[PDB]
Symmetry: D2
Subunit: 115 residues, 4 copies
Protein backbone atom coordinates (compact mmCIF):
# COMPACT_ATOMS: atom_id res chain seq x y z
CA UNK A 1 0.00 0.00 0.00
CA UNK A 2 2.84 2.46 0.62
CA UNK A 3 4.81 2.20 -2.60
CA UNK A 4 3.65 4.88 -5.07
CA UNK A 5 2.96 8.62 -5.30
CA UNK A 6 1.43 10.59 -2.43
CA UNK A 7 0.03 14.13 -2.38
CA UNK A 8 -0.45 16.63 0.45
CA UNK A 9 -2.99 19.48 0.60
CA UNK A 10 -0.35 22.13 0.03
CA UNK A 11 0.61 20.89 -3.41
CA UNK A 12 3.68 18.82 -2.46
CA UNK A 13 4.31 15.47 -4.03
CA UNK A 14 6.31 12.43 -2.95
CA UNK A 15 7.21 9.14 -4.70
CA UNK A 16 8.40 6.30 -2.39
CA UNK A 17 9.47 2.72 -2.71
CA UNK A 18 8.99 0.45 0.28
CA UNK A 19 11.58 -2.32 0.30
CA UNK A 20 11.08 -5.78 1.72
CA UNK A 21 13.54 -5.02 4.56
CA UNK A 22 11.86 -1.86 5.94
CA UNK A 23 13.66 0.62 3.73
CA UNK A 24 11.85 3.70 2.39
CA UNK A 25 13.54 5.53 -0.49
CA UNK A 26 12.33 8.25 -2.82
CA UNK A 27 12.09 11.88 -3.81
CA UNK A 28 10.15 14.89 -2.51
CA UNK A 29 8.96 17.49 -5.06
CA UNK A 30 6.83 20.65 -5.28
CA UNK A 31 10.81 20.95 -11.70
CA UNK A 32 14.35 19.80 -10.99
CA UNK A 33 15.25 22.67 -8.75
CA UNK A 34 12.47 21.61 -6.37
CA UNK A 35 13.29 17.89 -6.16
CA UNK A 36 14.98 16.45 -3.06
CA UNK A 37 16.11 13.02 -1.86
CA UNK A 38 14.27 11.17 0.86
CA UNK A 39 15.13 8.20 2.96
CA UNK A 40 13.26 6.39 5.72
CA UNK A 41 12.18 3.20 7.52
CA UNK A 42 8.81 1.45 8.11
CA UNK A 43 7.43 -1.56 10.07
CA UNK A 44 7.55 -4.43 7.60
CA UNK A 45 5.36 -6.64 9.86
CA UNK A 46 2.59 -4.54 11.40
CA UNK A 47 -0.02 -5.95 13.77
CA UNK A 48 -3.27 -7.43 12.51
CA UNK A 49 -5.67 -5.89 15.05
CA UNK A 50 -6.54 -3.19 12.52
CA UNK A 51 -3.70 -0.95 13.73
CA UNK A 52 -1.78 1.36 11.40
CA UNK A 53 1.73 0.85 10.02
CA UNK A 54 4.39 2.96 11.70
CA UNK A 55 6.91 4.82 9.53
CA UNK A 56 9.23 7.78 9.28
CA UNK A 57 11.37 9.71 6.83
CA UNK A 58 13.83 12.56 6.45
CA UNK A 59 14.55 15.25 3.88
CA UNK A 60 17.54 17.63 3.99
CA UNK A 61 16.72 20.63 1.76
CA UNK A 62 19.87 20.67 -0.30
CA UNK A 63 20.05 19.62 -3.90
CA UNK A 64 22.30 20.38 -6.90
CA UNK A 65 20.71 23.84 -7.23
CA UNK A 66 20.07 25.30 -3.78
CA UNK A 67 20.63 24.73 -0.04
CA UNK A 68 18.35 25.94 2.77
CA UNK A 69 20.61 24.50 5.48
CA UNK A 70 17.64 22.70 7.04
CA UNK A 71 16.11 19.24 7.38
CA UNK A 72 12.61 17.91 7.95
CA UNK A 73 11.61 14.59 9.56
CA UNK A 74 8.08 13.20 9.42
CA UNK A 75 6.77 10.67 11.96
CA UNK A 76 3.45 8.96 11.43
CA UNK A 77 1.38 6.06 10.23
CA UNK A 78 -0.04 4.51 7.08
CA UNK A 79 -3.76 3.64 7.03
CA UNK A 80 -4.80 1.54 4.05
CA UNK A 81 -8.28 1.02 2.63
CA UNK A 82 -10.23 3.02 0.06
CA UNK A 83 -9.12 6.30 1.51
CA UNK A 84 -5.57 5.11 2.11
CA UNK A 85 -3.82 7.87 4.10
CA UNK A 86 -0.50 8.60 5.75
CA UNK A 87 -0.97 10.74 8.88
CA UNK A 88 2.14 12.52 10.18
CA UNK A 89 3.63 15.00 12.58
CA UNK A 90 6.83 16.79 11.51
CA UNK A 91 9.83 18.68 12.85
CA UNK A 92 11.92 21.09 10.78
CA UNK A 93 15.31 22.15 12.08
CA UNK A 94 17.48 24.97 10.70
CA UNK A 95 21.22 25.32 11.35
CA UNK A 96 21.75 28.30 13.68
CA UNK A 97 24.38 29.75 16.01
CA UNK A 98 24.19 28.66 19.61
CA UNK A 99 22.64 32.05 20.47
CA UNK A 100 19.74 31.32 18.14
CA UNK A 101 19.15 27.65 18.93
CA UNK A 102 16.00 28.24 20.99
CA UNK A 103 14.19 29.17 17.78
CA UNK A 104 15.76 26.48 15.58
CA UNK A 105 12.84 24.00 15.36
CA UNK A 106 9.32 24.29 13.91
CA UNK A 107 6.61 21.69 14.45
CA UNK A 108 3.48 20.82 12.48
CA UNK A 109 1.40 18.15 10.80
CA UNK A 110 0.62 16.83 7.30
CA UNK A 111 -1.82 14.28 5.84
CA UNK A 112 -1.05 12.55 2.52
CA UNK A 113 -3.43 10.80 0.16
CA UNK A 114 -3.11 8.78 -3.05
CA UNK A 115 -5.41 11.08 -5.00
CA UNK B 1 32.83 15.12 11.85
CA UNK B 2 29.48 13.46 12.36
CA UNK B 3 31.06 10.13 11.47
CA UNK B 4 31.74 8.15 14.60
CA UNK B 5 30.28 6.64 17.73
CA UNK B 6 27.82 8.71 19.73
CA UNK B 7 26.14 8.29 23.11
CA UNK B 8 23.05 9.96 24.51
CA UNK B 9 22.28 11.02 28.03
CA UNK B 10 20.65 7.61 28.66
CA UNK B 11 23.55 5.44 27.49
CA UNK B 12 22.08 4.67 24.08
CA UNK B 13 24.62 4.15 21.27
CA UNK B 14 24.50 5.58 17.74
CA UNK B 15 27.12 4.45 15.29
CA UNK B 16 26.85 6.46 12.10
CA UNK B 17 28.55 7.06 8.81
CA UNK B 18 28.15 10.33 6.93
CA UNK B 19 28.29 9.98 3.17
CA UNK B 20 29.73 12.45 0.73
CA UNK B 21 26.28 12.70 -0.82
CA UNK B 22 24.46 13.80 2.38
CA UNK B 23 23.52 10.25 3.38
CA UNK B 24 23.48 9.01 6.95
CA UNK B 25 23.62 5.29 7.66
CA UNK B 26 24.26 3.30 10.80
CA UNK B 27 23.01 1.36 13.77
CA UNK B 28 21.21 2.42 16.95
CA UNK B 29 21.38 0.56 20.25
CA UNK B 30 18.90 1.72 22.89
CA UNK B 31 18.94 1.80 26.68
CA UNK B 32 15.14 2.13 27.17
CA UNK B 33 11.86 0.71 25.82
CA UNK B 34 10.87 -2.46 24.00
CA UNK B 35 14.35 -2.92 22.68
CA UNK B 36 17.19 -5.46 22.38
CA UNK B 37 20.32 -5.26 20.24
CA UNK B 38 20.83 -2.97 17.23
CA UNK B 39 18.31 -1.49 14.82
CA UNK B 40 19.07 -0.06 11.39
CA UNK B 41 19.05 3.69 10.90
CA UNK B 42 18.96 5.99 7.92
CA UNK B 43 18.87 9.74 7.45
CA UNK B 44 20.13 12.81 5.65
CA UNK B 45 22.34 15.79 6.51
CA UNK B 46 23.53 19.13 5.02
CA UNK B 47 26.82 18.35 3.27
CA UNK B 48 27.62 22.04 2.61
CA UNK B 49 26.71 24.11 5.62
CA UNK B 50 26.97 27.81 6.22
CA UNK B 51 30.41 29.16 7.10
CA UNK B 52 29.03 31.70 9.55
CA UNK B 53 29.44 29.45 12.55
CA UNK B 54 25.96 27.94 12.20
CA UNK B 55 25.26 24.31 13.05
CA UNK B 56 24.80 21.47 10.53
CA UNK B 57 21.16 20.41 10.08
CA UNK B 58 20.39 16.70 10.11
CA UNK B 59 17.83 13.96 10.80
CA UNK B 60 17.28 10.21 10.89
CA UNK B 61 14.74 7.44 11.49
CA UNK B 62 14.66 4.08 13.27
CA UNK B 63 11.75 1.60 12.96
CA UNK B 64 11.81 -0.67 16.07
CA UNK B 65 11.75 -3.98 14.32
CA UNK B 66 14.71 -6.35 14.23
CA UNK B 67 15.08 -10.15 14.18
CA UNK B 68 14.54 -10.30 17.95
CA UNK B 69 11.51 -8.06 18.46
CA UNK B 70 9.03 -5.63 16.94
CA UNK B 71 7.43 -2.78 18.90
CA UNK B 72 5.29 -1.53 15.95
CA UNK B 73 6.69 2.00 16.23
CA UNK B 74 9.23 4.41 14.72
CA UNK B 75 11.26 7.36 15.98
CA UNK B 76 12.56 10.37 14.02
CA UNK B 77 15.28 12.68 15.35
CA UNK B 78 15.65 16.18 13.88
CA UNK B 79 18.49 18.45 15.02
CA UNK B 80 21.92 19.90 14.37
CA UNK B 81 25.56 19.03 14.80
CA UNK B 82 27.83 21.57 16.49
CA UNK B 83 31.58 21.09 16.19
CA UNK B 84 34.14 22.47 18.56
CA UNK B 85 36.00 21.60 21.73
CA UNK B 86 32.95 19.65 22.89
CA UNK B 87 31.16 18.28 19.84
CA UNK B 88 27.51 17.44 20.33
CA UNK B 89 24.31 16.76 18.38
CA UNK B 90 21.14 18.40 19.73
CA UNK B 91 17.85 16.85 18.72
CA UNK B 92 14.12 16.84 19.15
CA UNK B 93 12.33 13.58 18.40
CA UNK B 94 8.91 12.16 17.67
CA UNK B 95 7.92 8.52 18.40
CA UNK B 96 4.81 7.19 16.65
CA UNK B 97 3.22 3.76 17.31
CA UNK B 98 0.68 1.97 15.12
CA UNK B 99 -2.86 2.31 16.59
CA UNK B 100 -6.50 1.95 15.61
CA UNK B 101 -8.31 5.17 14.69
CA UNK B 102 -10.07 5.61 18.02
CA UNK B 103 -6.68 5.76 19.69
CA UNK B 104 -4.65 7.74 17.19
CA UNK B 105 -4.82 10.89 19.40
CA UNK B 106 -2.37 9.26 21.75
CA UNK B 107 -0.09 7.74 19.17
CA UNK B 108 2.86 10.15 19.32
CA UNK B 109 5.40 10.96 22.05
CA UNK B 110 7.69 14.02 21.89
CA UNK B 111 11.07 14.57 23.57
CA UNK B 112 14.69 15.73 23.20
CA UNK B 113 18.08 14.01 23.12
CA UNK B 114 21.67 15.21 23.29
CA UNK B 115 24.53 13.11 21.89
CA UNK B 116 28.23 13.37 22.64
CA UNK B 117 31.28 11.32 21.59
CA UNK B 118 32.11 10.75 25.26
CA UNK B 119 30.06 8.11 27.03
CA UNK B 120 28.44 9.20 30.31
CA UNK C 1 -15.35 36.63 18.79
CA UNK C 2 -13.28 34.31 20.97
CA UNK C 3 -15.97 34.34 23.68
CA UNK C 4 -18.38 31.44 23.21
CA UNK C 5 -18.85 27.70 22.90
CA UNK C 6 -16.41 25.65 20.82
CA UNK C 7 -16.27 22.08 19.56
CA UNK C 8 -13.50 19.80 18.40
CA UNK C 9 -13.38 16.90 15.96
CA UNK C 10 -13.70 14.35 18.76
CA UNK C 11 -16.92 15.57 20.39
CA UNK C 12 -15.36 17.63 23.16
CA UNK C 13 -16.83 21.00 24.13
CA UNK C 14 -15.14 24.09 25.55
CA UNK C 15 -16.88 27.24 26.84
CA UNK C 16 -14.75 30.37 27.22
CA UNK C 17 -14.67 34.01 28.00
CA UNK C 18 -12.08 36.40 26.60
CA UNK C 19 -11.42 39.32 28.93
CA UNK C 20 -10.30 42.89 28.41
CA UNK C 21 -6.64 42.49 29.18
CA UNK C 22 -5.98 39.11 27.59
CA UNK C 23 -7.39 36.64 30.08
CA UNK C 24 -8.99 33.41 29.03
CA UNK C 25 -11.35 31.57 31.39
CA UNK C 26 -13.79 28.70 31.25
CA UNK C 27 -14.49 24.97 31.39
CA UNK C 28 -13.68 21.99 29.17
CA UNK C 29 -15.97 18.95 28.86
CA UNK C 30 -16.43 15.73 26.91
CA UNK C 31 -22.11 14.91 32.70
CA UNK C 32 -20.51 17.06 35.38
CA UNK C 33 -17.97 14.30 36.03
CA UNK C 34 -16.15 15.18 32.81
CA UNK C 35 -16.07 18.94 33.46
CA UNK C 36 -12.71 20.65 34.09
CA UNK C 37 -11.45 24.18 34.63
CA UNK C 38 -9.37 25.91 31.98
CA UNK C 39 -7.23 29.05 32.09
CA UNK C 40 -5.02 30.94 29.62
CA UNK C 41 -4.14 34.13 27.72
CA UNK C 42 -4.61 35.73 24.27
CA UNK C 43 -3.28 38.66 22.24
CA UNK C 44 -5.75 41.45 23.08
CA UNK C 45 -4.40 43.72 20.31
CA UNK C 46 -3.60 41.69 17.22
CA UNK C 47 -2.19 42.95 13.93
CA UNK C 48 -4.53 44.38 11.28
CA UNK C 49 -2.86 42.74 8.26
CA UNK C 50 -4.96 39.58 8.10
CA UNK C 51 -2.97 37.64 10.72
CA UNK C 52 -4.70 35.42 13.28
CA UNK C 53 -4.91 35.98 17.03
CA UNK C 54 -2.42 34.01 19.10
CA UNK C 55 -3.49 32.32 22.31
CA UNK C 56 -2.92 29.45 24.69
CA UNK C 57 -4.64 27.53 27.48
CA UNK C 58 -4.10 24.82 30.08
CA UNK C 59 -6.23 22.22 31.76
CA UNK C 60 -5.10 19.98 34.61
CA UNK C 61 -7.12 16.75 34.61
CA UNK C 62 -8.34 16.81 38.15
CA UNK C 63 -11.86 17.66 39.27
CA UNK C 64 -13.94 16.68 42.31
CA UNK C 65 -14.51 13.20 40.88
CA UNK C 66 -11.40 12.27 38.97
CA UNK C 67 -7.62 12.83 38.80
CA UNK C 68 -5.43 11.53 35.99
CA UNK C 69 -2.33 13.21 37.37
CA UNK C 70 -1.72 14.93 34.04
CA UNK C 71 -2.17 18.29 32.22
CA UNK C 72 -2.64 19.46 28.60
CA UNK C 73 -1.58 22.78 27.06
CA UNK C 74 -2.99 24.06 23.75
CA UNK C 75 -1.04 26.69 21.71
CA UNK C 76 -2.58 28.25 18.63
CA UNK C 77 -4.48 30.96 16.82
CA UNK C 78 -7.99 32.26 16.33
CA UNK C 79 -8.96 33.13 12.77
CA UNK C 80 -12.15 35.05 11.98
CA UNK C 81 -13.78 34.24 8.63
CA UNK C 82 -16.57 32.30 6.92
CA UNK C 83 -16.07 29.81 9.72
CA UNK C 84 -14.40 31.35 12.74
CA UNK C 85 -11.96 28.73 13.91
CA UNK C 86 -9.13 27.96 16.32
CA UNK C 87 -6.27 25.75 15.10
CA UNK C 88 -4.05 24.29 17.84
CA UNK C 89 -1.12 22.03 18.61
CA UNK C 90 -1.10 20.44 22.06
CA UNK C 91 1.14 18.87 24.65
CA UNK C 92 -0.02 16.44 27.37
CA UNK C 93 2.30 15.63 30.26
CA UNK C 94 1.73 12.83 32.76
CA UNK C 95 3.33 12.59 36.17
CA UNK C 96 6.02 9.88 35.85
CA UNK C 97 9.03 8.78 37.86
CA UNK C 98 12.36 10.03 36.59
CA UNK C 99 13.22 6.78 34.82
CA UNK C 100 10.01 7.05 32.84
CA UNK C 101 10.35 10.75 32.08
CA UNK C 102 11.37 10.14 28.44
CA UNK C 103 7.88 8.83 27.76
CA UNK C 104 5.89 11.39 29.74
CA UNK C 105 4.68 13.69 26.98
CA UNK C 106 2.27 13.29 24.06
CA UNK C 107 1.90 15.78 21.13
CA UNK C 108 -1.05 16.30 18.83
CA UNK C 109 -3.26 18.91 17.18
CA UNK C 110 -6.93 19.93 17.30
CA UNK C 111 -9.24 22.25 15.39
CA UNK C 112 -12.29 23.81 17.02
CA UNK C 113 -15.37 25.47 15.52
CA UNK C 114 -18.54 27.12 16.81
CA UNK C 115 -20.51 24.46 14.97
CA UNK D 1 6.91 23.27 46.71
CA UNK D 2 5.98 25.10 43.49
CA UNK D 3 5.29 28.57 44.90
CA UNK D 4 8.35 30.79 44.56
CA UNK D 5 10.95 32.19 42.13
CA UNK D 6 12.37 29.95 39.36
CA UNK D 7 15.25 30.37 36.93
CA UNK D 8 16.21 28.99 33.57
CA UNK D 9 19.66 28.92 31.97
CA UNK D 10 19.13 31.89 29.64
CA UNK D 11 18.46 34.75 32.03
CA UNK D 12 14.72 34.26 32.42
CA UNK D 13 12.84 34.54 35.69
CA UNK D 14 9.37 33.72 36.81
CA UNK D 15 7.51 34.15 40.04
CA UNK D 16 4.52 31.90 40.63
CA UNK D 17 1.89 31.34 43.25
CA UNK D 18 0.26 27.88 43.45
CA UNK D 19 -3.34 28.08 44.77
CA UNK D 20 -5.24 25.46 46.80
CA UNK D 21 -7.62 25.10 43.89
CA UNK D 22 -4.93 24.10 41.40
CA UNK D 23 -4.39 27.66 40.07
CA UNK D 24 -1.01 28.97 38.89
CA UNK D 25 -0.59 32.78 38.67
CA UNK D 26 2.41 35.06 38.36
CA UNK D 27 4.84 37.06 36.31
CA UNK D 28 7.42 36.09 33.72
CA UNK D 29 10.53 38.27 33.33
CA UNK D 30 12.24 37.54 30.01
CA UNK D 31 12.91 45.86 33.44
CA UNK D 32 9.10 46.16 33.63
CA UNK D 33 9.31 46.51 29.87
CA UNK D 34 10.13 42.76 29.99
CA UNK D 35 7.49 41.54 32.50
CA UNK D 36 4.45 39.57 31.31
CA UNK D 37 1.50 37.92 33.05
CA UNK D 38 1.34 34.14 33.42
CA UNK D 39 -1.54 31.76 34.11
CA UNK D 40 -1.91 27.98 34.41
CA UNK D 41 -2.98 24.88 36.32
CA UNK D 42 -1.32 22.00 38.23
CA UNK D 43 -2.32 18.76 39.96
CA UNK D 44 -3.28 19.79 43.48
CA UNK D 45 -3.21 16.20 44.68
CA UNK D 46 -0.30 14.34 43.18
CA UNK D 47 0.86 10.83 43.93
CA UNK D 48 3.31 10.19 46.79
CA UNK D 49 5.02 7.35 45.00
CA UNK D 50 7.95 9.32 43.54
CA UNK D 51 6.11 10.69 40.50
CA UNK D 52 6.38 14.38 39.64
CA UNK D 53 3.48 16.85 39.75
CA UNK D 54 1.97 17.67 36.34
CA UNK D 55 1.45 21.32 35.37
CA UNK D 56 1.15 23.86 32.55
CA UNK D 57 1.06 27.64 31.99
CA UNK D 58 0.71 30.28 29.27
CA UNK D 59 2.25 33.70 28.58
CA UNK D 60 0.92 35.90 25.78
CA UNK D 61 3.75 38.31 24.89
CA UNK D 62 1.84 41.59 25.27
CA UNK D 63 2.22 44.08 28.12
CA UNK D 64 1.61 47.83 28.32
CA UNK D 65 4.89 48.46 26.50
CA UNK D 66 5.23 45.99 23.67
CA UNK D 67 3.50 43.21 21.76
CA UNK D 68 5.02 40.38 19.79
CA UNK D 69 1.67 38.94 18.62
CA UNK D 70 2.45 35.47 19.91
CA UNK D 71 1.94 33.12 22.88
CA UNK D 72 3.98 30.40 24.60
CA UNK D 73 2.61 27.41 26.55
CA UNK D 74 4.74 25.24 28.88
CA UNK D 75 3.76 21.63 29.71
CA UNK D 76 5.80 19.61 32.21
CA UNK D 77 6.30 18.39 35.72
CA UNK D 78 7.63 19.54 39.07
CA UNK D 79 10.08 17.27 40.84
CA UNK D 80 10.87 17.91 44.52
CA UNK D 81 13.85 16.93 46.60
CA UNK D 82 17.16 18.65 47.21
CA UNK D 83 17.63 19.49 43.55
CA UNK D 84 14.10 20.56 42.79
CA UNK D 85 13.28 21.38 39.20
CA UNK D 86 10.51 21.89 36.67
CA UNK D 87 11.17 20.06 33.39
CA UNK D 88 9.19 21.41 30.43
CA UNK D 89 8.45 21.22 26.76
CA UNK D 90 7.05 24.36 25.14
CA UNK D 91 5.21 25.56 22.08
CA UNK D 92 5.38 29.13 20.76
CA UNK D 93 2.72 30.25 18.31
CA UNK D 94 2.80 33.51 16.36
CA UNK D 95 -0.06 35.19 14.54
CA UNK D 96 0.37 34.52 10.79
CA UNK D 97 -1.86 34.76 7.71
CA UNK D 98 -3.32 31.51 6.31
CA UNK D 99 -0.50 31.35 3.74
CA UNK D 100 2.13 31.11 6.49
CA UNK D 101 0.28 28.98 9.00
CA UNK D 102 2.65 26.02 8.33
CA UNK D 103 5.49 28.01 9.90
CA UNK D 104 3.58 29.47 12.87
CA UNK D 105 4.74 27.14 15.67
CA UNK D 106 8.14 26.56 17.34
CA UNK D 107 8.91 23.70 19.72
CA UNK D 108 11.52 23.52 22.44
CA UNK D 109 12.37 22.57 25.98
CA UNK D 110 13.47 24.22 29.21
CA UNK D 111 14.50 23.32 32.72
CA UNK D 112 13.90 25.63 35.68
CA UNK D 113 15.58 25.62 39.09
CA UNK D 114 15.33 27.31 42.46
CA UNK D 115 18.85 28.65 42.14
Amino acid sequence: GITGTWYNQLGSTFIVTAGADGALTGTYESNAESRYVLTGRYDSAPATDGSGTALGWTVAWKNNYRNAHSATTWSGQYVGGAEARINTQWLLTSGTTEANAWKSTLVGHDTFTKV
